[PDB]
Amino acid sequence: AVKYYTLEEIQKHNNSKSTWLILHHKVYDLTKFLEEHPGGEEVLREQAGGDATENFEDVGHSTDARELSKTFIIGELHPDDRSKIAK
Ligand code: HEM
Ligand SMILES: [Ca+2]
Ligand SMILES: [Ca+2]
């Protein structure tokens, strides 16, 4: 009962009205969060419409931040795109 979104669809959610990104094959709707994110808005905007897995780990996000991230999950990357995008 995973909801899947294609990469082609996710790429459209790249603006102030709808900003999504991908972390570890899951899709996060950060449209509203980016106004609250402690790391600022632009790092998230930069990533909108695509995968940001590497950026998210490289920062060293706290466990608290991971836990918070789960609240923004709206679905997962379609299986057809899971060799293009890794996990
Ligand atoms: C839904 C996903 C995300 C959530 C919930 C989130 C949450 C947070 C929170 C709560 C902090 C404060 C420090 C901490 O708790 O570790 C933080 C800091 C930061 N975040 Fe995120 N973040 C997310 C995604 C990202 C992404 C994808 C990037 C980069 C593209 C990013 C870049 C940063 C930076 C640069 C800081 C500031 C430096 C630091 O505190 O280490 N964040 N984030
Ligand atoms: Ca703000
Ligand atoms: Ca703003």
Residue numbers in the entry: 8 to 94
Question: What does the report in the manuscript say about this coordinate set?
Answer:
In this work, we report the crystal structures of porcine b5 determined at sub-angstrom resolutions in both the oxidized and reduced forms. The haem Fe atom is coordinated by two axial ligands, His44 and His68, and the haem group is not bound covalently to the protein moiety. The haem orientation in porcine b5 corresponds to the major isomer observed in the rat b5 structure. The comparison using high-resolution structures revealed that structural differences around the haem group may be important for regulating the electronic properties of the haem.
The crystal structures were determined at resolutions of 0.83 Å (oxidized form 1), 0.93 Å (oxidized form 2), 0.76 Å (reduced form 1) and 0.95 Å (reduced form 2). Form 1 and 2 crystals were obtained at pH 7.4 and 5.5, respectively. One of the Ca2+ ions (Ca-1) is coordinated by the side-chain carboxyl groups of two glutamic acid residues, Glu42 and Glu48, located around the axial ligand His44. On the other hand, the uniform C—O distances in the oxidized form 1 structure indicate that the 7-propionate group is in a charged state. Unrestrained refinement was also applied to the 6-propionate group in the oxidized form 1 structure. The C—O1 [1.253 (9) Å] and C—O2 [1.246 (10) Å] distances are consistent with the results for the 7-propionate group. The hydrogen-bond distance from His68 Nδ1 to Phe63 O is 2.893 (6) Å in the oxidized form 1 structure and 3.097 (5) Å in the reduced form 1 structure. The interactions with Arg89* and other interactions with the neighbouring molecules in the crystal fix the structure from Phe63 to His68, and small spaces exist between the adjacent molecules. In addition, water molecules were found near the main-chain atoms of Phe63 and His68 in the form 1 structures. The water molecules form hydrogen bonds to both the main-chain carbonyl of Phe63 and the main-chain amide of His68. The hydrogen-bond distances in the oxidized form 1 structure are shorter (0.2–0.4 Å) than those in the reduced form 1 structure.
